[PDB]
Nucleic acid binder design. Structure first.
Length: 493
DNA sequence: TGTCCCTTCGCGTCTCT
DNA sequence: AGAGACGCGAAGGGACA
């Protein structure tokens, strides 16, 4: 809409169609995405030098270009990337993905320029890996983090005996500069006076809005312990996972949730020690009545649902969809809670709703199964992936459905499934594995990296060679995936 | 109306034992 | 194996030009 001058919105839609055109092929959603967080000059600039970016020394993918553009100061980044990508890759040995990853943030120009300028001095003089330097820089106001890290790292490590690991941890977030400065200032105070281990202080600062969480603790720490009878351990739990808002909100709503709604302080901390703790608490304060109602649920279960990232979303979604699932799709509430009691509950429930019938009719599954898939983190993703990949896995690669469901019924189901599709061939023919084995490996959390690891060891029998036969390596990877396999290589080093 | 920086929230995946 | 660490990104707000 955005009126100022006119006649020249023609020049704006001139470009919109041309980007659906060939070097890039942008769909609607992508142009949305650009224009929305990038603005119009972003869109203009993409067009401007679409060819320059797709070939030439840069050879970026469309989705990479979008990623960079879709941020405040996208134009600036795109310009800046053209300039600096090759020099950063050549003169400091970064990958493109790394350069892009630095750029794909607000004030990308600044990060890139600041990386160029300071990558060496940090890597050389302060002995940092470039991995780490990229980590610090790959955020909003990286320039500031980078700059601050230079300034304070000697001070933090000598005067307050902090590992560089820890400094990186703190700086590798939004508002690093703030977190760092705040830690310097408040470390003595918090450790000596309020009796915290520096590990705890870093724990707190090593999230976004750490500055805020730190300040808020120094203030509210005694209060919460003396008055509301909380342990400092509990307070740091909250301060590390939900930070400022959660702390404040806890003080504000603790008495209420115990007097009126009868929860144990134990449980209140559970709920608040997460992202959007503030949000969850306020949500359970409402709703908890109307949830222990419609027959509905016990407090145990409402707590369960709220005690995750985006608890609010879960509770709101549960409240809304509990009827339609229970009556129209025949699920006990026990199951609905199971689904809701993970990260992205909302997302699972909604996905279940719309895919239950499909999987059960079209793909021949019991509801019990679908719930199992859905009763994990990233339920949505597993469900959706099962839908795509069940046929192809059963026919092209020759698995039973019960096997596919097993693979899917774990955190990261999506990945497991996708990874099986990629590797099951090479594994079974080229290295002589037997599908039932491959499935067993994949039917755990970390199924993907399990597989990826197991392969890498066979394709190039790594430093610790011979020694373990394949049936062993399988046994091991079923027992602890990549962690185990790595733990064996590190038993030879 | 663009650019930069900071804080809060939500989703997904893996590992720690 | 459920808790907790970790990575990622959307969204919203403030400051300045």
């Amino acid at each position: 809409m955005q009126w100022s001058g006119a006649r020249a919105l023609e020049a704006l839609l001139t470009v919109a169609g041309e980007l659906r055109g060939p070097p890039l092929q942008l769909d609607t959603g992508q142009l949305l995405k650009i224009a929305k967080r990038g603005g119009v000059t972003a869109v203009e600039a993409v067009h401007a030098w679409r060819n320059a970016l797709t070939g030439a020394p840069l050879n970026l993918t469309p989705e990479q270009v979008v990623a960079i553009a879709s941020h405040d100061g996208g134009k600036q980044a795109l310009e800046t990337v053209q300039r600096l990508l090759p020099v950063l890759c050549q003169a400091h040995g970064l990958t493109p993905q790394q350069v892009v990853a630095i750029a794909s943030h607000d004030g990308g120009k600044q990060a890139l320029e600041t990386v160029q300028r300071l990558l060496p001095v940090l890597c050389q003089a302060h002995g940092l890996t470039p991995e780490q330097v990229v980590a610090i820089a790959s955020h909003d106001g990286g320039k500031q983090a980078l700059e601050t890290v230079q300034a304070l790292l000697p001070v933090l490590c000598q005067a307050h005996g902090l590992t560089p690991e820890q400094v990186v941890a703190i700086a590798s977030n939004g508002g690093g500069k703030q977190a760092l400065e705040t830690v310097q200032r408040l470390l003595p105070v918090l450790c000596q006076a309020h009796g915290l281990t520096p590990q705890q202080v870093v724990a707190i600062a090593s999230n976004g809005g750490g500055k805020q969480a730190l300040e808020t603790v120094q203030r509210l720490l005694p209060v919460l312990c003396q008055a509301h009878g909380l342990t400092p351990q509990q307070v740091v739990a909250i301060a590390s996972r939900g930070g400022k808002q959660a702390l404040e909100t806890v003080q504000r709503l603790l008495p209420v949730l115990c007097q009126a709604h009868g929860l144990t302080p134990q449980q209140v901390v559970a709920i608040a020690s997460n992202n959007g703790g503030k949000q969850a608490l306020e949500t359970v304060q409402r709703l908890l009545p109307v949830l222990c109602q419609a027959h509905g649920l016990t407090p145990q279960q409402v707590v369960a649902i709220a005690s995750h990232d985006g608890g609010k979303q879960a509770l709101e979604t549960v409240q809304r969809l509990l009827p339609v699932l229970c009556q129209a799709h025949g699920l006990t509430p026990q199951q609905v809670v199971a689904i809701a009691s993970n990260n992205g509950g909302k997302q699972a429930l909604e996905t279940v709703q719309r895919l239950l019938p499909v999987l059960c009719q079209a793909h021949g599954l019991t509801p019990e199964q679908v719930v199992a898939i859905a009763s994990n983190g990233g339920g949505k993703q597993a469900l959706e992936t099962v839908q795509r990949l069940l046929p192809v896995l059963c026919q092209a690669h020759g698995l039973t459905p019960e096997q596919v469901v097993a693979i899917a019924s774990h955190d990261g189901g999506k990945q497991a499934l996708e990874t099986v599709q990629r590797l099951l061939p090479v594994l079974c023919q080229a290295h002589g594995l037997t599908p039932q084995q491959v499935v067993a490996i994949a039917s755990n959390g970390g199924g993907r990296p399990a597989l990826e690891s197991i392969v890498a060891q066979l394709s190039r029998p790594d430093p610790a060679l011979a020694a373990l036969t394949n049936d062993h390596l399988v046994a091991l990877a079923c027992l602890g995936g990549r962690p185990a396999l790595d733990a064996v290589k590190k038993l030879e080093h």
